[PDB]
Amino acid sequence: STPAITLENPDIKYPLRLIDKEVVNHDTRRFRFALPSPQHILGLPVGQHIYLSARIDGNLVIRPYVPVSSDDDKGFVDLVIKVYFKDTHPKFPAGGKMSQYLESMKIGDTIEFRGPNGLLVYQGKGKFAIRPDKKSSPVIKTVKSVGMIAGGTGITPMLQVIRAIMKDPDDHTVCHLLFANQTEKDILLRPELEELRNEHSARFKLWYTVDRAPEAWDYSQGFVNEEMIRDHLPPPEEEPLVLMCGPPPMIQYACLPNLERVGHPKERCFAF
Ligand SMILES: Cc1cc2nc3c(=O)[nH]c(=O)nc-3n(C[C@H](O)[C@H](O)[C@H](O)COP(=O)(O)OP(=O)(O)OC[C@H]3O[C@@H](n4cnc5c(N)ncnc54)[C@H](O)[C@@H]3O)c2cc1C
Ligand SMILES: NC(=O)C1=CN([C@@H]2O[C@H](COP(=O)(O)OP(=O)(O)OC[C@H]3O[C@@H](n4cnc5c(N)ncnc54)[C@H](O)[C@@H]3O)[C@@H](O)[C@H]2O)C=CC1
């Protein structure tokens, strides 16, 4: 028999109870929610995300988040979410709606989950099923290596895929991650990433850039650029899939032009 599935229907909302919150850094936390019983699984293909929804201040608010847990995990789901606080940034006095609602939840409070959703599914052993859009059937891309460019919380879909690969000893796909954040203290999930490197260095290449670097720094500095792509992702002739996820300007100005300069074609690139 197979475990009971939480997300049985993508149009149903499932209220899940918050059970734990763990600090990732000054503004980011892992939020762990209980599934309907301890034996359930979420029901989420690798590559997919969920949506959270709530009535915040009298208006329904819906936002997507990528679980970093998997269908191997019985009884819980983990999200890694950056909180955009009010009364902090001069351009954003109110902060972010959903992320502060989440930050304010008490353990035992519920929030509605729905899913799965997304254009990409990782089918294992280098196989990716990618829809060109939400109005098209998937096509299955088969690769030996995967470049991953993440900015900030854009790490979450990358980590979800990395974890899926590394746990299968017969999955020979090599992941090359280039992870960009504003400062060293903004790096998310660093111990794991470095733990994954320590354990799986033949399948996992790790590199960082930060917008402003500290004095003691052995990685790159600045926005993602041509040189970083050329040095820290597989080269075009090895026909990798290049996955990217981060702020819209990151994608538009740092990733797309520089991917084109290196020679990774559109049709081998995917933005979460
Ligand atoms: C498919 C998908 C999956 C996603 N998965 C994740 C995920 O796994 N983890 C995750 O954390 N996010 C994820 N996001 C983003 C997420 O959906 C929300 O957009 C995010 O949580 C912000 O929503 P909000 O309602 O808090 O902010 P909103 O109220 O919608 O917006 C406020 C915006 O103002 C800016 N802002 C406000 N206050 C500050 C501040 N103090 N400092 C800097 N900027 C500020 C930010 O740009 C912020 O997004 C994902 C996005 C997509 C498209
Ligand atoms: N589609 C998905 O599955 C997911 C999407 N995301 C998105 O990722 C983003 C994460 O935002 P934050 O963590 O707040 O990022 P952030 O604002 O802290 O920026 C992270 C990095 O993005 C790059 N970047 C930012 N502005 C740039 C610019 N003007 N030019 C070039 N590069 C720039 C920089 O390298 C920076 O260090 C959000 O937009 C979020 O919606 C997050 C998780 C998953």
**CATH number for the domain including 62?**
2.40.30.10
Which residue in 29, 185, 43, 60 sits closest to 114, CA to CA?
Answer: 43
Full domain range(s) for residue 44:
14-117
Question: How many folded domains does the chain comprise?
Answer: 2
Please name every residue paired with 64 in a beta bridge, in sequence order, or none if there are none: 51
- Resolution of the experimental model, in Å, one decimal: 0.9
| Distance of CA 40 from the midpoint of ligand 2 (Å) | 33
Residue 153 has which token pair? 């919380």
Residue with tokens 């600090």, as numbered in its chain: 23
* Residues 32, 15: Cα–Cα separation, whole Å: 13
Q: Is residue 4 part of a domain?
A: no
Q: Same structural domain for residues 59 and 138? A: no
Domain stop point among 91, 117, 143: 117
Experimental method: X-ray
| Distance of CA 155 from the midpoint of ligand 2 (Å) | 9
* Residues 157, 65: Cα–Cα separation, whole Å: 9
* Residues 62, 2: Cα–Cα separation, whole Å: 30
* Residues 168, 54: Cα–Cα separation, whole Å: 36
What 3-state DSSP class applies to 69? coil
Residue 230 labeled ligand binder: no
Q: Which positions ≥6 away from 27 have C-beta within 8 Å?
A: 82, 83, 84, 85
Residue nearest to atom 33 of ligand 2 (CA): 250
Residue 174 labeled ligand binder: no
Q: Is residue 244 part of a domain?
A: yes
Q: Is residue 8 part of a domain?
A: no
Is residue 41 within 8 Å of 71, Cβ to Cβ?
yes
Is residue 73 within 8 Å of 163, Cβ to Cβ?
no
Ligand 1 in contact with 81 (CB < 6 A)?
Answer: yes
Domain stop point among 100, 117, 134: 117
Is residue 140 within 8 Å of 123, Cβ to Cβ?
yes
| Distance of CA 100 from the midpoint of ligand 2 (Å) | 18
Residue nearest to atom 33 of ligand 1 (CA): 96
Cα–Cα distances in Å, from 240 out to 64, 175, 201? 27, 9, 18
Domain stop point among 96, 117, 138: 117
Amino acid at 27: D
Q: Same structural domain for residues 72 and 146? A: no
Q: Is residue 220 part of a domain?
A: yes
Residue 161 has which token pair? 């895929």
| Distance of CA 233 from the midpoint of ligand 1 (Å) | 27
Q: Same structural domain for residues 150 and 201? A: yes
Q: Is residue 9 part of a domain?
A: no
Is residue 80 within 8 Å of 29, Cβ to Cβ?
yes
Ligand 1 in contact with 181 (CB < 6 A)?
Answer: no
Ligand 1 in contact with 174 (CB < 6 A)?
Answer: no
* Residues 146, 204: Cα–Cα separation, whole Å: 10
**Strands (DSSP E) found in the chain:** 14-23, 28-34, 49-56, 59-65, 76-82, 110-117, 120-124, 127-130, 139-142, 145-151, 174-181, 204-210, 220-221, 241-245, 269-271
Q: % helix / strand / coil in the chain, to the nearest 5?
A: 25, 35, 40
100 alpha carbon, closest ligand: 1
Q: Is residue 6 part of a domain?
A: no
